Amino acid sequence: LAPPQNVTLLSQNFSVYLTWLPGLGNPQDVTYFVAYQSSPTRRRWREVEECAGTKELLCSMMCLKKQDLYNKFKGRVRTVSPSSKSPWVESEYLDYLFEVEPAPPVLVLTQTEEILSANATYQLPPCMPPLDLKYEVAFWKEGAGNKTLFPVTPHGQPVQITLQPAASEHHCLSARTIYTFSVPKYSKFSKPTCFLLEVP
Amino acid sequence: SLSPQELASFKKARDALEESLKLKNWSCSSPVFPGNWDLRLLQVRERPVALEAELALTLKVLEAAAGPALEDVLDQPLHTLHHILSQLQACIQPRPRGRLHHWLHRLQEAPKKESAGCLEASVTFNLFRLLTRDLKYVADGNL
Numbered sequence: 001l002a003p004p005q006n007v008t009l010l011s012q013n014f015s016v017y018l019t020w021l022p023g024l025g026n027p028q029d030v031t032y033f034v035a036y037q038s039s040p041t042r043r044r045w046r047e048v049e050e051c052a053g054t055k056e057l058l059c060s061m062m063c064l065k066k067q068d069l070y071n072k073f074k075g076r077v078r079t080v081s082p083s084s085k086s087p088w089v090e091s092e093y094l095d096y097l098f099e100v101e102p103a104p105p106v107l108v109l110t111q112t113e114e115i116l117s118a119n120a121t122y123q124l125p126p127c128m129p130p131l132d133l134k135y136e137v138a139f140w141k142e143g144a145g146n147k148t149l150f151p152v153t154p155h156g157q158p159v160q161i162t163l164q165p166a167a168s169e170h171h172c173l174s175a176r177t178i179y180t181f182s183v184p185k186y187s188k189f190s191k192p193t194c195f196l197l198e199v200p
Numbered sequence: 201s202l203s204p205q206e207l208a209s210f211k212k213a214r215d216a217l218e219e220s221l222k223l224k225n226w227s228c229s230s231p232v233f234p235g236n237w238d239l240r241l242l243q244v245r246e247r248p249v250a251l252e253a254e255l256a257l258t259l260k261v262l263e264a265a266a267g268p269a270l271e272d273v274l275d276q277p278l279h280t281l282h283h284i285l286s287q288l289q290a291c292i293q294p295r296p297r298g299r300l301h302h303w304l305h306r307l308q309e310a311p312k313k314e315s316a317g318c319l320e321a322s323v324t325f326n327l328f329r330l331l332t333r334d335l336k337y338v339a340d341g342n343l
């Protein structure tokens with residue numbers, strides 16, 4: 001059996017995944033088995049239960065038992081059929097704190113009088129290390145040339161916007177996450193949430 | 201919190217230490233940091249004490265590792281560690297036993313029973329969890 005190809009450990013939305021491509025030899029209804037390294041001070045390849053014999057070309061590698069996201073670790077995949085097992089193919093190391101890719105927040109909007117508050121929230125993997133997330137809110141009139149950007153704000157705090165009573169136009173908000181460990185990582189801006197402003 | 205530059209310099213040192221470990225034996229007879237070590241398992245009053253003990257051990261091991269080959273890359277990291285240790289000591293106000301006593305005992309014994317390679321590998325791989333997780337829990341209940 002031809003081993004999986006282009007075996008890659010990557011991060012998306014705060015999580016980690018292993019992906020790959022089928023072996024050079026291209027039999028069918030072949031399955032795949034996946035494993036990961038545990039912590040460097042108690043290392044052992046462990047299998048990912050849910051990916052065992054998968055026919056998919058990826059595997060979630062987040063919040064695994066005995067995983068240590070504070071150090072490098074690799075995943076490995078092999079191709080398997082009844083008629084053979086391929087050799088293992090390892091990924092590069094992935095070092096979560098320095099390579100995780102943040103998702104945009106989901107903004108929660110409340111309004112009181114002339115103050116509109118836009119508050120970031122996130123669905124975070126339960127094992128995630130406590131990252132310092134901040135976010136940057138963009139605000140604008142639908143179709144307008146320029147946008148306004150509010151000061152970068154810590155997860156935990158809302159962004160406060162003063163409304164103009166008479167501006168009953170369709171407006172729009174969006175935000176991205178800034179995650180800075182040793183170098184700033186920016187997520188994309190979230191999909192705009194839009195609404196008709198009305199003060200009284 | 202720790203600035204991007206402090207964190208970049210820790211990473212450079214952590215990677216250089218990990219490299220040097222590929223070329224020695226660093227088996228440990230017992231885990232230097234107990235496998236379940238986690239300040240969130242301790243009472244708020246106990247957390248600074250645990251944090252201090254791992255910090256002092258970390259400093260002592262990395263200083264002994266800081267030979268002519270590594271002294272340049274370890275200089276910022278040691279300076280930062282000293283400063284964290286001093287800030288922490290300034291805030292530490294001074295019959296069955298629990299996890300805190302057991303863990304301090306394991307830390308205290310490690311330098312007596314284990315090889316230098318073992319102590320270096322153990323503080324090296326514990327370093328970013330110390331800096332990002334343990335330091336954070338303590339800074340919640342600061343006193």
Ligand SMILES: *[C@@H]1O[C@H](CO)[C@@H](O[C@@H]2O[C@H](CO)[C@@H](O[C@@H]3O[C@H](CO)[C@@H](O)[C@H](O)[C@@H]3O)[C@H](O)[C@H]2NC(C)=O)[C@H](O)[C@H]1NC(C)=O
Pocket residue numbers: 119120121122155156157158
């Ligand atoms: C804006 O949204 C954020 C969430 O993205 C809110 O911050 C979160 O607020 C909740 C409610 O108080 C906090 O929950 C609790 O956490 C504490 C700390 O462990 C715990 O003792 C309680 O049992 C409860 O689980 C949560 O910690 C906090 N998250 C943060 C700050 O990251 C915030 O309240 C919202 N602001 C608004 C609506 O103005």
Ligand SMILES: *[C@@H]1O[C@H](CO)[C@@H](O)[C@H](O)[C@H]1NC(C)=O
Pocket residue numbers: 005006
């Ligand atoms: C696939 O892997 C091969 C071998 O390393 C490489 O040459 C090629 O650029 C990769 N392409 C994709 C799409 O992964």
Ligand SMILES: *[C@@H]1O[C@H](CO)[C@@H](O)[C@H](O)[C@H]1NC(C)=O
Pocket residue numbers: 013015103123124125
């Ligand atoms: C991102 O991850 C969280 C936590 O696992 C999940 O609940 C959420 O649905 C994810 N969001 C996206 C855009 O897939």
